[PDB]
């Protein structure tokens, strides 16, 4: 009966490196329209998620903003 | 019987950097319009989440803002 | 019977840094717009979440920003 | 056999940034007469505003330097 | 059967930044006459206003120096 | 046999920032006559003002110096 051995050993010397030399002058100014929601007579049997709104908005201005991402996996029998 | 042997041992030595000299003059208006929601005679069995809103706002001005995300996962029988 | 022997010993010498030489002159005016909500006649027969606002704000400038989330799992028979 | 190593590298080397205004002659400069007459003006928004008849506006993120200097020396590896 | 290592480098290098305003003249500079003369004017937002009428701005952001120097002597590992 | 190593490596080299301003001559400067009149304004919001005649402004956010130096000698492990 056969043993067996594993060896797991990756190695990472990765770099992910960002130089800006300014970052900015930025104008952002969205604007929702109206929203009007009506409703009658619905019947729901199972949950519900509603969201009702008229502007979702993310402004997202990084000096770097770099992503890594290592994902690690090992499965025996 | 067989023996099993498993040796885990990644190695990281990796980077995520970054440099802005520098980051500003940012002008940010956002403007939600009107929302109105006329609900009537509506029936629910299970559950609800329900959200209204004129503007939903996230403004994220790190001077890094890098990620690194990492999973290291061994499963054995 | 058959031995089983796991060495888990990952290595990490990892980094995650940034440099902003300045980080201001931000202006920031969110406008939530008018909410009007209206109900009769609504049946519920399990929790309800409800969440009702004009004007929902995040803002956040952090001289940094930079996250490090990292998982170890090992799972034995 | 006898081994000698000699290892005299010399550096005499310069490495000089010059940035912005240097060594200008500015004789006798002059700035007009500067005359900003406002009647019934509305602003319903952020203002940003400079008057001024004469500047010297100087602005140096740059003229950075950098010197790297490796020395190796390895006898029988 | 002899060894004679000699590790002698000179380093007189020079690194320099003159970054800004640096040896100039300026000989009689004159702003002119700044005049702001403002009726009936309404502002529903912020107002930043700078009024001068001779201006000298230096800003340095800049000019850094970064020197690196690594000496290595390796004799049988 | 016999062996012998000298390590005497020489640093006489310079690092120098001369950042901002420097060794100007500002002969007989002259801000002009400011007149700054108002009636009858309406301010909703934040009023930042700056009213002057002459102004000599020197930032130095920069001008760092950095000196890494090593040095290492290894014998036979």
Same mark, same amino acid.
């Given at each position: 009966?056969?043993?067996?051995?594993?060896?797991? =050993?990756?190695? +990472?010397?990765?770099?992910?490196?960002? =130089?800006?030399?300014?970052?900015?002058?930025?104008?952002?100014?969205? $604007?929702?329209?109206?929203?009007?929601?009506?409703?009658?007579?619905? +019947?729901?049997? !199972?949950?519900?998620?509603?969201?009702?709104?008229?502007? !979702?908005?993310?402004?997202?201005?990084?000096? $770097? $903003?770099?992503?890594?991402?290592?994902?690690? =996996?090992?499965?025996?029998?």
């Amino acid at each position: 009966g056969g043993s067996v051995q594993i060896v797991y =050993k990756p190695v +990472d010397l990765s770099k992910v490196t960002s =130089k800006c030399g300014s970052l900015g002058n930025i104008h952002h100014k969205p $604007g929702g329209g109206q929203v009007e929601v009506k409703s009658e007579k619905l +019947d729901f049997k !199972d949950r519900v998620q509603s969201k009702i709104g008229s502007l !979702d908005n993310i402004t997202h201005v990084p000096g $770097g $903003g770099n992503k890594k991402i290592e994902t690690h =996996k090992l499965t025996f029998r």
